[PDB]
Amino acid sequence: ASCETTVTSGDTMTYSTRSISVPASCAEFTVNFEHKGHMPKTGMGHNWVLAKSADVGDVAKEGAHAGADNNFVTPGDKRVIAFTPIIGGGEKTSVKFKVSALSKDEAYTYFCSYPGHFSMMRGTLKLEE
Ligand SMILES: [Cu+2]
């Protein structure tokens, strides 16, 4: 009944885990995200973006053109359920979201939207009954 999890990244294009389970008993869930590499966000930035799996492609396409100042996420993108800002080496961030925003009928994917990272840096998130 833990309603928090920690996902790390580094100077590669992989997350530390590729599956996150959110307990349906949680009212809110927190994802802590840390970058343990030594390269900065200009060249090796990472973020954690959550969307329904069918929407990842379009969110990633539009987000790549939104710019670093918009964390590579289109401003007001209604397909993004929750996201963190981009972080570089030695930085940490987190995001908390309401578990009621998720449905048991849908599939979800978390991924990094820094240009060129989404194909490898992605995982599945599911609501655990
Ligand atoms: Cu990344």
- CATH for the 1-129 domain, from 3.40.718.10, 3.90.1580.10, 2.60.40.420, 3.30.450.90: 2.60.40.420
**In the Cβ-directed half-sphere of 5, how many Cα atoms lie within 13 Å?**
17
Of 120, 126, 77, 86, residue with least CA distance to 106: 126
CA of 30 relative to ligand 1 center, distance in Å: 19
**Three-state SS for 97?**
strand
The answer to whether the annotation marks 3 as part of a ligand binding site is no
52 backbone dihedrals φ, ψ, rounded to 5°: -65, 150
Beta carbons within 8 Å of 110's beta carbon, 6+ residues apart: 7, 15, 20, 31, 48, 49, 50, 122, 123, 124, 125
Whole-number Å distance between alpha carbons of 83 and 89 = 18
Size (the chain), residues: 129
Query: Do 101 and 28 contact (CB within 8 A), yes or no?
Result: no
Q: What approach was used to elucidate this structure?
A: X-ray
CA dihedral 66, 95, 112, 123 (to 10 degrees): -150
The answer to whether the annotation marks 117 as part of a ligand binding site is yes
Resolution (in Å) of the shown entry? 1.6
**Domain extents in the chain:** 1-129
